[PDB]
Amino acid sequence: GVIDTSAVESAITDGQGDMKAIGGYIVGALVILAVAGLIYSMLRKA
């Protein structure tokens, strides 16, 4: 912690803050992979 809130905030920006970055970065890669699906579908179709 309750008293931490202060120092906790800092950790929140990193942990919680860095969390959002991970979700975005991870999604970025997922999007790239999905590109292959379409490419294959186009080549297999087409």
User: What does the longest C-alpha to C-alpha distance in the chain come to?
Assistant: 63
Question: Comparing C-alpha atoms, which of 35, 29, 32 is closest to residue 43?
Answer: 35
| Angle, vertex CA 43, rays to CA 38 and CA 44, nearest 5 | 95
**Fold for the domain defined by 1-46:** 1.20.5
From the centroid of its chain, how far is CA 7? 25
The residue type at 40: Y
d(CA 31, CA 7): 36
Q: Which DSSP helix (H) or strand (E) runs through 40?
A: helix 5-44
- Experimentally, the structure was elucidated by NMR
Q: Which DSSP helix (H) or strand (E) runs through 41?
A: helix 5-44
